[PDB]
PDB file of N, CA and C in Angstrom:
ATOM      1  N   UNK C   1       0.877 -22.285   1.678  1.00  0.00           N
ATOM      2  CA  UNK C   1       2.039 -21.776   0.893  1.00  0.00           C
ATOM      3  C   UNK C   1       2.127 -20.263   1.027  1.00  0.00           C
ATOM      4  N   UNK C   2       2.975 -19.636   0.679  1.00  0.00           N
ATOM      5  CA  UNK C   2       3.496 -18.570   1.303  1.00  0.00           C
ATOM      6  C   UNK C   2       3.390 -17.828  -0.270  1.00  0.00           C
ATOM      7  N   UNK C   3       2.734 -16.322   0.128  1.00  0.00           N
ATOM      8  CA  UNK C   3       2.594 -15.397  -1.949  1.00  0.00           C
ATOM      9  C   UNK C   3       3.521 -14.937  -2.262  1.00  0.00           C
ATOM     10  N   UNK C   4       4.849 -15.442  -2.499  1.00  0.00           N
ATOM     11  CA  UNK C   4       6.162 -14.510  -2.830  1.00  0.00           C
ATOM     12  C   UNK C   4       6.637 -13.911  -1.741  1.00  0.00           C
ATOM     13  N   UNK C   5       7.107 -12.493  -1.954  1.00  0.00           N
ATOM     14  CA  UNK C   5       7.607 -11.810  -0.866  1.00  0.00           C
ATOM     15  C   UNK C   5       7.278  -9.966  -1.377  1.00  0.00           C
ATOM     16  N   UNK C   6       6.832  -9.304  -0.482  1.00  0.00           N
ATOM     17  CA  UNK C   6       6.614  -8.088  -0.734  1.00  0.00           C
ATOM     18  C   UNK C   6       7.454  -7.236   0.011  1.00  0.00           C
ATOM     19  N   UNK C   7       8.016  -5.661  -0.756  1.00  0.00           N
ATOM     20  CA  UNK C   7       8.441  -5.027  -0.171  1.00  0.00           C
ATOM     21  C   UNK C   7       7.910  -4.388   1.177  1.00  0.00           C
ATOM     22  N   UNK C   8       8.636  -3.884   2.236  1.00  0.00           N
ATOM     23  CA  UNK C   8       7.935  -3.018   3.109  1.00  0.00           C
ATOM     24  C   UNK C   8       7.397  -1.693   2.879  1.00  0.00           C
ATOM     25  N   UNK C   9       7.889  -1.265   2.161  1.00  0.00           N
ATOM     26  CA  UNK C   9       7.156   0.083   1.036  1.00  0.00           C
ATOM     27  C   UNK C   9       6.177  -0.029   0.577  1.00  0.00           C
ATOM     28  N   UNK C  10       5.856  -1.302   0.213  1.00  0.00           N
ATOM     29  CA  UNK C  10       4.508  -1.552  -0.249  1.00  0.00           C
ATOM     30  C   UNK C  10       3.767  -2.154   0.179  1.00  0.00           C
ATOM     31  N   UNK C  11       3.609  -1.933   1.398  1.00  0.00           N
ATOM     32  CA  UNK C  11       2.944  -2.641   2.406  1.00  0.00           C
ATOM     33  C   UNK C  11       2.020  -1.370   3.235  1.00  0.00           C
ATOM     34  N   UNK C  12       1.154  -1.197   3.706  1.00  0.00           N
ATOM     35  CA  UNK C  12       0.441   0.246   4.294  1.00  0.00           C
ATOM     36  C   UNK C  12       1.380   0.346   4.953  1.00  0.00           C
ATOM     37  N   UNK C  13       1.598   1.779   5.675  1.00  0.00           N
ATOM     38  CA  UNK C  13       2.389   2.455   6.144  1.00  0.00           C
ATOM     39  C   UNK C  13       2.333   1.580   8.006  1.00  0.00           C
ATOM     40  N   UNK C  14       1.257   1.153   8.465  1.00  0.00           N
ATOM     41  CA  UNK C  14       1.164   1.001   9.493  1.00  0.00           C
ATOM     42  C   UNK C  14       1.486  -0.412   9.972  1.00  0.00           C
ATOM     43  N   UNK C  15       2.176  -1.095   8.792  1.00  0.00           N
ATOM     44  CA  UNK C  15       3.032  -2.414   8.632  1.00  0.00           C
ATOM     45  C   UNK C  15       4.631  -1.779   9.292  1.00  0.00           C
ATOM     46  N   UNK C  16       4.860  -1.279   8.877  1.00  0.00           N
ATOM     47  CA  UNK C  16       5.968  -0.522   9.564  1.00  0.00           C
ATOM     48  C   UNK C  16       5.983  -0.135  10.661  1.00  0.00           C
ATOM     49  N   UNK C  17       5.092   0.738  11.270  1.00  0.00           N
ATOM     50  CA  UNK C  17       4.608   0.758  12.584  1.00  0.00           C
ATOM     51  C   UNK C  17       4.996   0.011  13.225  1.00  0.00           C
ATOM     52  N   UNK C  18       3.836  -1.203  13.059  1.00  0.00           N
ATOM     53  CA  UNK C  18       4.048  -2.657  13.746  1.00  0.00           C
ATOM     54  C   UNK C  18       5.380  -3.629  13.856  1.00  0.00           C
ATOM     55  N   UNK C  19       6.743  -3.369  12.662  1.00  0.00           N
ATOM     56  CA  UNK C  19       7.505  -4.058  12.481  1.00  0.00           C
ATOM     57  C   UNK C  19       8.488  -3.100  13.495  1.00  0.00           C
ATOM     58  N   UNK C  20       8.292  -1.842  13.706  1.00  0.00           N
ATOM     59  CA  UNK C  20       8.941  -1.196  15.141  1.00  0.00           C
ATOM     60  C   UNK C  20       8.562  -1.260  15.903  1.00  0.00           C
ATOM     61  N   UNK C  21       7.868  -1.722  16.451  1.00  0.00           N
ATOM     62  CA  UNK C  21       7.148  -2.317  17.882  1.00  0.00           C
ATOM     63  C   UNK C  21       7.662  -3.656  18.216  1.00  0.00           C
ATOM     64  N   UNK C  22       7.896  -4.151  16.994  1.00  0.00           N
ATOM     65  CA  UNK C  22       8.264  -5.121  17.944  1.00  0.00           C
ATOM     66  C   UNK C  22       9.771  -5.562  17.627  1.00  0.00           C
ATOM     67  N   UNK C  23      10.484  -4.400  16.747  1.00  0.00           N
ATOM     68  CA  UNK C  23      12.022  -4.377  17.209  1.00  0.00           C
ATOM     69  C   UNK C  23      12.169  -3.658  18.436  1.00  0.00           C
ATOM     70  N   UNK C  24      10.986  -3.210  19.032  1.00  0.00           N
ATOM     71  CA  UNK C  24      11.356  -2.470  20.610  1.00  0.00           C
ATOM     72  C   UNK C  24      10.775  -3.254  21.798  1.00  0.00           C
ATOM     73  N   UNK C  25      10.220  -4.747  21.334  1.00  0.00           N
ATOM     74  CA  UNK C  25       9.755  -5.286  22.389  1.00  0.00           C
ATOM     75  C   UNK C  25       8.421  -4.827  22.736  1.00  0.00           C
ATOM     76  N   UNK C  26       8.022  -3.937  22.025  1.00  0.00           N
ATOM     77  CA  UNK C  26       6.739  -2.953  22.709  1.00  0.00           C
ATOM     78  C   UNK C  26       6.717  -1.550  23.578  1.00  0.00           C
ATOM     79  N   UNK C  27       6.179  -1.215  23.786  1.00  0.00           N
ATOM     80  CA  UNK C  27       4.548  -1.812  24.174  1.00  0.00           C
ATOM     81  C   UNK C  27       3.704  -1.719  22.811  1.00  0.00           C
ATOM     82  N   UNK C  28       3.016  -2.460  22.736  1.00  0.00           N
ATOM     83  CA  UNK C  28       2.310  -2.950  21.680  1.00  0.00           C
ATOM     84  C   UNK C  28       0.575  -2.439  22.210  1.00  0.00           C
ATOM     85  N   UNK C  29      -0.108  -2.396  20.864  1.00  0.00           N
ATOM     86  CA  UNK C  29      -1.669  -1.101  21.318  1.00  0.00           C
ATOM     87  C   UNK C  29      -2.212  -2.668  21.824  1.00  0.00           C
ATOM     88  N   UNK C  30      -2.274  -3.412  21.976  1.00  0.00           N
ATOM     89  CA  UNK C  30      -3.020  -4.798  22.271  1.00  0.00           C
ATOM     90  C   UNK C  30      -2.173  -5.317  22.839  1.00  0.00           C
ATOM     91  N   UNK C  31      -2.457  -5.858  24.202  1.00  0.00           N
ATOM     92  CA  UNK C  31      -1.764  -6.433  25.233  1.00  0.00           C
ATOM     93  C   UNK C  31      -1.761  -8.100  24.655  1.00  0.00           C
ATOM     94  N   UNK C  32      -2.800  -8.651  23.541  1.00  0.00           N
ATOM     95  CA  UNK C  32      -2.110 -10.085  22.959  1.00  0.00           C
ATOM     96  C   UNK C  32      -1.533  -9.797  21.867  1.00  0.00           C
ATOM     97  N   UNK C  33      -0.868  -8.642  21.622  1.00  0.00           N
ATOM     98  CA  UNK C  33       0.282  -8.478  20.832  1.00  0.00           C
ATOM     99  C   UNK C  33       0.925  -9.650  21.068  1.00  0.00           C
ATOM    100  N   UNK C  34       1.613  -9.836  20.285  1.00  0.00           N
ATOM    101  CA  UNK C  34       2.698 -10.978  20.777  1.00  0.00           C
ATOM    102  C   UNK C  34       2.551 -12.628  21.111  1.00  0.00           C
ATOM    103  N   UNK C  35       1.319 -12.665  21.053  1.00  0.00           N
ATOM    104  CA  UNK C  35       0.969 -14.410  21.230  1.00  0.00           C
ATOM    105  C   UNK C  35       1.205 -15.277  20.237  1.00  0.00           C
ATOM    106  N   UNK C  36       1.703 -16.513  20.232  1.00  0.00           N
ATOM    107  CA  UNK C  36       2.259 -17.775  19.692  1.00  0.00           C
ATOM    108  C   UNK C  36       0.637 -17.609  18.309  1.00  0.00           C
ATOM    109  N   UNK C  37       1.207 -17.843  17.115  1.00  0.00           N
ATOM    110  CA  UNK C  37       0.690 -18.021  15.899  1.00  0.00           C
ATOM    111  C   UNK C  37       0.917 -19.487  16.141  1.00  0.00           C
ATOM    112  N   UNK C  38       0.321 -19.985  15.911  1.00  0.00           N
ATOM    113  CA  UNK C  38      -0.431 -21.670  15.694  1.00  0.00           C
ATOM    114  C   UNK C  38       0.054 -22.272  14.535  1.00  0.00           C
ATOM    115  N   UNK C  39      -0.435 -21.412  13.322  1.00  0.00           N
ATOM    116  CA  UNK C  39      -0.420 -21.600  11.954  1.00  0.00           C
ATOM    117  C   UNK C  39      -1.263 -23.302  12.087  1.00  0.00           C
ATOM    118  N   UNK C  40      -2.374 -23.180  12.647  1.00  0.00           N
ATOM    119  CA  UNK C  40      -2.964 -24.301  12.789  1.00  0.00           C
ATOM    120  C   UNK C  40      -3.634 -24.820  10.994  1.00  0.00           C
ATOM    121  N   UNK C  41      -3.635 -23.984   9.926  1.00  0.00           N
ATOM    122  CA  UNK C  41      -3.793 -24.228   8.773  1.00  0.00           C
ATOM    123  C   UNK C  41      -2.850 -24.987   7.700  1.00  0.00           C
ATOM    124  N   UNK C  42      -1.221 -24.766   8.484  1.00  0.00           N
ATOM    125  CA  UNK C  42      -0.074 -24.963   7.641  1.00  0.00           C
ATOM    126  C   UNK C  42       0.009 -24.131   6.637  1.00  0.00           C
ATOM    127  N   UNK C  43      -0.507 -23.007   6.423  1.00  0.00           N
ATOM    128  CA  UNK C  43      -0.202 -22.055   5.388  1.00  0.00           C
ATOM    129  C   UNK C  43       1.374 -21.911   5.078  1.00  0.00           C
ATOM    130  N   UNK C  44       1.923 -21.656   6.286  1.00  0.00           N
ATOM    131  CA  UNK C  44       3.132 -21.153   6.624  1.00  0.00           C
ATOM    132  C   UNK C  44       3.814 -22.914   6.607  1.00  0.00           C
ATOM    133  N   UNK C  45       5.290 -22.474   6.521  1.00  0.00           N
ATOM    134  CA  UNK C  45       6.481 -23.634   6.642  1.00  0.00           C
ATOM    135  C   UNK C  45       5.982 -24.304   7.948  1.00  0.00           C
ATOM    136  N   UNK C  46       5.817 -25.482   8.248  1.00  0.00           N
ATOM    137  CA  UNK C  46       5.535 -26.266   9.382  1.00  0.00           C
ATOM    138  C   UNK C  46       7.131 -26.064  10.531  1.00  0.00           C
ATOM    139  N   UNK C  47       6.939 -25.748  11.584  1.00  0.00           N
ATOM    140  CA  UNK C  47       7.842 -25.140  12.769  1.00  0.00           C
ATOM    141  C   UNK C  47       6.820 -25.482  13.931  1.00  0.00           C
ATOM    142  N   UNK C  48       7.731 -26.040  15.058  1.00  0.00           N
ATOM    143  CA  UNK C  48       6.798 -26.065  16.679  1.00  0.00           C
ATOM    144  C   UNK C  48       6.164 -25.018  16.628  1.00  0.00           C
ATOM    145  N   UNK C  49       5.514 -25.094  17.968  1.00  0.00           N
ATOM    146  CA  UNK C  49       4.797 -24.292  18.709  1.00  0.00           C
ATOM    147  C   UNK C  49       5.590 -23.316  19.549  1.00  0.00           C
ATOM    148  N   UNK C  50       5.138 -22.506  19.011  1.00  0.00           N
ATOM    149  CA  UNK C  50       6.095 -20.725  19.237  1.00  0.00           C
ATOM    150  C   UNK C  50       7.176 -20.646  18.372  1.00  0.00           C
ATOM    151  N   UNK C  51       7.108 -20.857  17.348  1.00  0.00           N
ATOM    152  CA  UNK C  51       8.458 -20.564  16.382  1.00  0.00           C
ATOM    153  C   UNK C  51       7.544 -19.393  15.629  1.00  0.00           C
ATOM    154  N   UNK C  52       6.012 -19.139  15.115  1.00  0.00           N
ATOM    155  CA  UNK C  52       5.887 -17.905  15.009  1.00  0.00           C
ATOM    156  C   UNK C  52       4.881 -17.222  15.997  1.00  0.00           C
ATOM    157  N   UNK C  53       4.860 -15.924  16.021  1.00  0.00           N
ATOM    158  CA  UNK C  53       3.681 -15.015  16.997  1.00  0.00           C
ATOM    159  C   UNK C  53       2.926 -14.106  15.918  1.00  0.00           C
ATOM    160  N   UNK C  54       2.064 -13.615  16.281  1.00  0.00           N
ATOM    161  CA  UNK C  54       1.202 -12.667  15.381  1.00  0.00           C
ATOM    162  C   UNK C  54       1.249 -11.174  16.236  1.00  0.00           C
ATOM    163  N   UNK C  55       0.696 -10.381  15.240  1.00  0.00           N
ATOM    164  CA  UNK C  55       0.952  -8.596  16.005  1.00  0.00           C
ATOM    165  C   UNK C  55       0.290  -8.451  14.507  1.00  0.00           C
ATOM    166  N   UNK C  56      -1.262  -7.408  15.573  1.00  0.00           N
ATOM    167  CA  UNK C  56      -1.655  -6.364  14.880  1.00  0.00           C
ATOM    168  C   UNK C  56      -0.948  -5.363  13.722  1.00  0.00           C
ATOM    169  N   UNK C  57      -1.507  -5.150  12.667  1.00  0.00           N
ATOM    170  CA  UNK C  57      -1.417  -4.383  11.777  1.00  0.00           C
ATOM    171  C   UNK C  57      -2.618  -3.210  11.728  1.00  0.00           C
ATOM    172  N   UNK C  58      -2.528  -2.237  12.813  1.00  0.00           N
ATOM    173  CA  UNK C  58      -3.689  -1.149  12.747  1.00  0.00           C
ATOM    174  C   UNK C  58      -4.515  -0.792  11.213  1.00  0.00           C
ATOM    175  N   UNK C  59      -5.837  -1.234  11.466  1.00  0.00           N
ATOM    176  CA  UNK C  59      -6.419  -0.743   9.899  1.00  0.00           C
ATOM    177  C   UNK C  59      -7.347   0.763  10.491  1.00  0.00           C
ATOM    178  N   UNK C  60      -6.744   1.284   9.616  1.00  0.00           N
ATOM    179  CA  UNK C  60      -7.593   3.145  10.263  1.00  0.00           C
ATOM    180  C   UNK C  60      -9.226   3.031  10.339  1.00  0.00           C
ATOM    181  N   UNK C  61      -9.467   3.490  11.012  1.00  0.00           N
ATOM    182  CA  UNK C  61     -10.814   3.681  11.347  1.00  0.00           C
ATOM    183  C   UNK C  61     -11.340   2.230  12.331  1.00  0.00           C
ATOM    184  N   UNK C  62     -11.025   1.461  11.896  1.00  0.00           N
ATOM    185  CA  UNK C  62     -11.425   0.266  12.578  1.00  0.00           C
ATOM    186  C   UNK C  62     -11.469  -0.086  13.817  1.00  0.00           C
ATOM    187  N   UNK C  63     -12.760  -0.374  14.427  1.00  0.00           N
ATOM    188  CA  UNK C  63     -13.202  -0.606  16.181  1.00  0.00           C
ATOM    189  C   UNK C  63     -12.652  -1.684  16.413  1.00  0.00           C
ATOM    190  N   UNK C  64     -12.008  -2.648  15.419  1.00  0.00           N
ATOM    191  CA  UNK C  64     -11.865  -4.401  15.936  1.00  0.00           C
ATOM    192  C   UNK C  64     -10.530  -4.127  15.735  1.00  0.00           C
ATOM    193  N   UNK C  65      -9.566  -5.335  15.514  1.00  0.00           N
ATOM    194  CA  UNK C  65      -8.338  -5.403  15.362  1.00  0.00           C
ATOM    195  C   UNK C  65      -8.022  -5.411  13.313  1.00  0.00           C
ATOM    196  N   UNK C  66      -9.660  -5.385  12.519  1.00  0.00           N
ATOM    197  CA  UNK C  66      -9.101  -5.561  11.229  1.00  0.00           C
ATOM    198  C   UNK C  66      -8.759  -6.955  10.620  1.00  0.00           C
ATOM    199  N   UNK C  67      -8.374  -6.997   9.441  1.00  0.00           N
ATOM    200  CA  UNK C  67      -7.484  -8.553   8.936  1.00  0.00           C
ATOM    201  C   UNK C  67      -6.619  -8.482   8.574  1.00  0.00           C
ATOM    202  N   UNK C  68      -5.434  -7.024   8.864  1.00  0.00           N
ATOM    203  CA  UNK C  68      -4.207  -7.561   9.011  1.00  0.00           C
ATOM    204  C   UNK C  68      -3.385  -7.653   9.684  1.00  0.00           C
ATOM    205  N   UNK C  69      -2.528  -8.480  10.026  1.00  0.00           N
ATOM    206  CA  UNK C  69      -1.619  -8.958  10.740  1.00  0.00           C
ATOM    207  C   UNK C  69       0.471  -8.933  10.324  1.00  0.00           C
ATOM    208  N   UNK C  70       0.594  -9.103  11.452  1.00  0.00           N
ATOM    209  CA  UNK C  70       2.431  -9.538  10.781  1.00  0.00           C
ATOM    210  C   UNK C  70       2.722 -10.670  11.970  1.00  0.00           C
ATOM    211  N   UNK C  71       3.143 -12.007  10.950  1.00  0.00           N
ATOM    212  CA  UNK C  71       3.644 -12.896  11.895  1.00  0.00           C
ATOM    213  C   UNK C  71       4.939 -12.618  11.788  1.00  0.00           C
ATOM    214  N   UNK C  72       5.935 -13.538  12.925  1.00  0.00           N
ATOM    215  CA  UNK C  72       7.235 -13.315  12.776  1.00  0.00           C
ATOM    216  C   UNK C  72       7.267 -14.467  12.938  1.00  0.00           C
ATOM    217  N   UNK C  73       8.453 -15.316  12.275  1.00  0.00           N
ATOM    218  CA  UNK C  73       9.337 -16.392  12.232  1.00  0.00           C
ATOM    219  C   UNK C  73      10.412 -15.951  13.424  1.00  0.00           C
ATOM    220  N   UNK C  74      10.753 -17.302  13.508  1.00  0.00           N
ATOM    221  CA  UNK C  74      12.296 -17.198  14.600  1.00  0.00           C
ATOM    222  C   UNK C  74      13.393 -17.021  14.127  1.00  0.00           C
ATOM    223  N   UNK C  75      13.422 -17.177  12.294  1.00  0.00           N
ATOM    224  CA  UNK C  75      14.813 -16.916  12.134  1.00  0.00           C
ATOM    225  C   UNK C  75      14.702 -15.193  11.894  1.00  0.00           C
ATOM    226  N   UNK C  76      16.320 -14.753  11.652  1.00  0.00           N
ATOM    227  CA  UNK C  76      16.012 -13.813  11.358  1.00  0.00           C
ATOM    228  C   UNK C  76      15.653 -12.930  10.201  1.00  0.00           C
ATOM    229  N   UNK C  77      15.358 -11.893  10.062  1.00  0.00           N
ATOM    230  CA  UNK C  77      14.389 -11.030   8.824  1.00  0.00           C
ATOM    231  C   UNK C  77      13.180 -11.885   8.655  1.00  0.00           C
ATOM    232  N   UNK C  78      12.660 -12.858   9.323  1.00  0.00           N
ATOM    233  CA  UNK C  78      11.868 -13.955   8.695  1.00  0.00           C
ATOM    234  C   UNK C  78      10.281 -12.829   9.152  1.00  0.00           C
ATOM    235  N   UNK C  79       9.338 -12.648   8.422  1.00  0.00           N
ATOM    236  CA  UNK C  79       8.053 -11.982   9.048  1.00  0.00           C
ATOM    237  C   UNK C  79       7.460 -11.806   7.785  1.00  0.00           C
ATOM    238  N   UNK C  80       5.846 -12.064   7.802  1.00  0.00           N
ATOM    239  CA  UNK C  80       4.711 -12.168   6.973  1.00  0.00           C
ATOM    240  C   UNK C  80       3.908 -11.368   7.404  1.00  0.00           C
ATOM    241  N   UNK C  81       3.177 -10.834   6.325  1.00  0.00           N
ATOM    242  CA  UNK C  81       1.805  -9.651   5.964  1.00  0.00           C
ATOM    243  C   UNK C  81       0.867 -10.753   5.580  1.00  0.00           C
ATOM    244  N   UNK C  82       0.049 -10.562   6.533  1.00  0.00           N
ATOM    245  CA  UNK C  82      -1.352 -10.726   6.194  1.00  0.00           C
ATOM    246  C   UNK C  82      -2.445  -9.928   5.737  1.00  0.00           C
ATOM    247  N   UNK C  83      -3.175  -9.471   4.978  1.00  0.00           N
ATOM    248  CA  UNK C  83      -4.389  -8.615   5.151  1.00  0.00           C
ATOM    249  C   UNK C  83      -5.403  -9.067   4.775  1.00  0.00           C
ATOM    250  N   UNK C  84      -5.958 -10.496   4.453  1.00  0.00           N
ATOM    251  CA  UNK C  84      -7.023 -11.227   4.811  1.00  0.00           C
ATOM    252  C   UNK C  84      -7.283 -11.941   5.433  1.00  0.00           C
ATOM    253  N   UNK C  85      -6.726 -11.515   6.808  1.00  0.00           N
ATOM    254  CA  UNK C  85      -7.098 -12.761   8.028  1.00  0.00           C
ATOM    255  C   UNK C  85      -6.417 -13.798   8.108  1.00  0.00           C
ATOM    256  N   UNK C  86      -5.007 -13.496   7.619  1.00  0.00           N
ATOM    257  CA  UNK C  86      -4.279 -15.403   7.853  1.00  0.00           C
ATOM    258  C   UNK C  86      -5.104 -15.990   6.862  1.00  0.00           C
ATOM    259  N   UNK C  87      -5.717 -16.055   5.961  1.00  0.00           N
ATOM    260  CA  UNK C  87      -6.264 -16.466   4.395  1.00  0.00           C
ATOM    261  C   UNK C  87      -4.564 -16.922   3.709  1.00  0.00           C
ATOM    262  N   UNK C  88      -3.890 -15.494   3.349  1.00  0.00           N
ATOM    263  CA  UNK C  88      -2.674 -15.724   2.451  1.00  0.00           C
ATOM    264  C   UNK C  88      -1.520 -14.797   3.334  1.00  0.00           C
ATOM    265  N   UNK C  89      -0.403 -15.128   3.204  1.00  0.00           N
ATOM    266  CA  UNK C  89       0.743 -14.579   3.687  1.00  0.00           C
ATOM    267  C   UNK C  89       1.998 -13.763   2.978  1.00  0.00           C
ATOM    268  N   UNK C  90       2.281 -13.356   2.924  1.00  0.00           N
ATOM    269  CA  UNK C  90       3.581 -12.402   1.416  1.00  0.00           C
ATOM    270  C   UNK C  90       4.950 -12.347   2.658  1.00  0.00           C
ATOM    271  N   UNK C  91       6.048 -12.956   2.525  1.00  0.00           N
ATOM    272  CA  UNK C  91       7.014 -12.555   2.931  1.00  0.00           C
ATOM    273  C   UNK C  91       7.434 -11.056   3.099  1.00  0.00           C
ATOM    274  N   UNK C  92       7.997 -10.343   4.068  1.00  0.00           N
ATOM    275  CA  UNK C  92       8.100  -8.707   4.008  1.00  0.00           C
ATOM    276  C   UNK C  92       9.392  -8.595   3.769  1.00  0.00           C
ATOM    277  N   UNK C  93       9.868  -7.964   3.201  1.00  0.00           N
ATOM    278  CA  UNK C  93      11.584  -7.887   2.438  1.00  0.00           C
ATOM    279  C   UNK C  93      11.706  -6.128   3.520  1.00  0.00           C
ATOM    280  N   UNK C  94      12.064  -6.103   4.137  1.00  0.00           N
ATOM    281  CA  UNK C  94      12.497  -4.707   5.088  1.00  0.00           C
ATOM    282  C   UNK C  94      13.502  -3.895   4.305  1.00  0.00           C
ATOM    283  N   UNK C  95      14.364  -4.370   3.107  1.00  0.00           N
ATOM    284  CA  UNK C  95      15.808  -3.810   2.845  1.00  0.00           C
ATOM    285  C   UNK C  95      15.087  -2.629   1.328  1.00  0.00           C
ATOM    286  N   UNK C  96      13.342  -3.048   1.097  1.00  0.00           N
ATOM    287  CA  UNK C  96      12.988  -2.068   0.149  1.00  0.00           C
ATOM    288  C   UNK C  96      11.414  -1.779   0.345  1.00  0.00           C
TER     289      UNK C  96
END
């Protein structure tokens, strides 16, 4: 199930980042930017395979990729914050 929906303001700054990267297609800091999200848990609304992808959410300082993420849905405005690893998901509202 999906935690409500959170603003993009209130989301770390580097959620934003990431949500312009990939209104530009990229280039993205991780070349598996962009790979098919599974949602092999069903957390998320059940959709085929490739209806969402995942993309890094840079956590500062961090040597690994971190635990958060932004998936995107296929429809549009559709995209989720993760920051415990695909654990829980918050809808991202972009318009605040």
């Amino acid at each position: 199930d999906v935690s409500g929906t959170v603003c993009l303001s209130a989301l770390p700054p580097e959620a934003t980042d990431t949500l312009n990267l990939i209104a530009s297609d990229g280039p993205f800091p991780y070349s598996q930017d962009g790979v098919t999200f599974q949602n092999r848990e069903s957390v998320l609304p059940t959709q085929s395979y490739g209806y969402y992808h995942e993309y890094t959410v840079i956590t500062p300082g961090a040597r690994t990729r971190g635990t958060r993420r932004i998936i995107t849905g296929e429809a549009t405005q559709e995209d989720y914050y993760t920051g415990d690893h695909y654990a829980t998901f918050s809808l991202i509202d972009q318009t605040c």
